[PDB]
């Protein structure tokens, strides 16, 4: 079925591959070549998870966990049961995400809007590929990647983190968190502001953008504006994920020690490093 204003937008065109062969919708969903590709990769990855589950001897989603190959496998293929299922499921995940993105692009072209959304979803994909592909390759083994299970992947984050002491001390981890925290702060404020102008005090007319500007000027001495804030939210979220990828791609590839050691570039600097007093002297 259709939204009341949707019909006028359901025209032929926009596809990158297949011509008009896959140029149709199932219910609300656009299909396209990349919709059948997504389905093929998602169908196959889910079947392989369920195969992994029959092998593990459980149906409980809380317990199902597809581990990657042992480290001793390096970057070779492994037998289905001992990491091969993870390797294929990862290939299927990657092809699904990339296909989902290319499908978003087809949808952008049909509606004549910018490609900002798939460009943005690509950063999430690159972060995934950092943990699952780029870092493991630079480190020498697929086993360094995270296992596909609801709780076992958390344990991976715990084990990987504590290999380098407190991971808080990773300077790129600090920047990423700063961007994450600032992102949620910004989203709360933007969502509030628009809502506060659209849904004002009882017995008041709907507010204008000038009110939105004036509120943030009164409160903080600066309004970034309607365009600026949507630019900012995009910048913050993307930056957060970029510095996430960065802080992991350097961990175990060019940095191997406890991360707290990084900060001696400042403390144990020759001139003030000897001076008596403070914490580190």
């Amino acid at each position: 079925a259709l939204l009341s204003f949707e019909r006028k937008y359901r025209v032929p065109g926009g596809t990158l591959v297949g011509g008009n062969l896959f140029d149709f919708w199932v219910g609300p969903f656009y299909v396209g070549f990349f919709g059948v590709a997504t389905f093929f990769f998602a169908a196959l990855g889910i079947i392989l998870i369920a195969w992994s589950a029959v092998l593990q001897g459980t149906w409980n989603p809380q317990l199902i966990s597809v581990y990657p190959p042992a480290l001793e496998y390096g970057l070779g293929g492994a037998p289905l049961a001992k990491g091969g299922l993870w390797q294929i499921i990862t290939i299927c995940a990657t092809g699904a995400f990339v296909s989902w993105a290319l499908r978003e692009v087809e949808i952008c072209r049909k509606l004549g809007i910018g490609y900002h959304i798939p460009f943005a979803f690509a950063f999430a994909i690159l972060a995934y590929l950092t943990l699952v592909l780029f870092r493991p390759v630079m480190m020498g083994a697929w086993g360094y990647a995270f296992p596909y299970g609801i709780w076992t992947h958390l344990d991976w984050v715990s084990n990987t983190g504590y290999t380098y002491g407190n991971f808080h001390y990773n300077p790129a981890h600090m920047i990423a968190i700063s961007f994450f925290f600032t992102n949620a702060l910004a989203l709360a404020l933007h969502g509030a502001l628009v809502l506060s102008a659209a849904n004002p005090e009882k017995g008041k007319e709907m507010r204008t953008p000038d009110h939105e500007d004036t509120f943030f000027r009164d409160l903080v001495g600066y309004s970034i504006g309607t365009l600026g804030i949507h630019r900012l939210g995009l910048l913050l979220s993307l930056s957060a994920v970029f510095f996430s990828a960065l802080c992991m791609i350097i961990t175990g590839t060019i940095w191997f020690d406890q991360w707290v050691d990084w900060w001696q570039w400042w403390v144990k600097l020759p001139w003030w490093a000897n001076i008596p007093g403070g914490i580190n002297g």
């Binding site: 984050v157 808080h168 102008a197 970034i224 365009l227 804030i229 949507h230 630019r231 979220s237 001076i275």
Partner: protein, 301 residues
Amino acid sequence: AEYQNIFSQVQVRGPADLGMTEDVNLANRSGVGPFSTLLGWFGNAQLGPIYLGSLGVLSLFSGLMWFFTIGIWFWYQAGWNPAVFLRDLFFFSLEPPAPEYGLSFAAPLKEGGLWLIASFFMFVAVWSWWGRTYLRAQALGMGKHTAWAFLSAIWLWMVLGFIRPILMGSWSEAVPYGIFSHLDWTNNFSLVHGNLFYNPFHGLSIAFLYGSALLFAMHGATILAVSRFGGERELEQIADRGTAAERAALFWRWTMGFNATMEGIHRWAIWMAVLVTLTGGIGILLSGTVVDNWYVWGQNH
């Protein structure tokens, strides 16, 4: 290539907007600040004016007293040595009283009393500011959404610094005032409580923090993608649906089977972000007071 509307091609400067009067007392509104061509590439160029009423100055003064209290203690830990100050700035820590003193304000200055004085000033400074986000909105005839979402953040803060330590019987359970020390306190907190990954409220808080980055990336991209139909002007799209709103919704309906509206997405936004600190506060509040070990607790319930 195609222009992306991330940075402006041409800036435009005009008479500064002094802003909406409404019920604002203009006596407390400052003069207009100057324009920033650097900021103008990305957002607005105008700086100010700002409102600074009886409550805003109280907040500024208590916030500064907090900074000057942390600062005077950092200098004393440095032995009044400016070179040592810069080198160990991130390692200094105003720690709370030890457990022996419990919830008493009777601790000597050098062993946690100064922490209590800092905490007083920060308590006055945050609540003064929260009253301010409320009053600014009231005077402009706006909703109180900014104040109510701000209470969510204050709640997590209130739990870490005040409500949890009080139910635990000692100020020593509170968070120390230091860059690196507050991270170490955060790590010990999880170790002590049997891995905070297994605190279901911590996992919710993560879902919402990750989900805030997801949602703002989605909405920021969406609006920039329909800014060619004036989509950033969200209030006129709410009052009078334009093709910007329509295309945006259909992008997502076609992509994931369902969509928002121009107003409605900002409800998704305010809750996604608010639930970060709301769940997080609950989860911290329950650690130690009700559940000693989250991993253990998880394997039974």
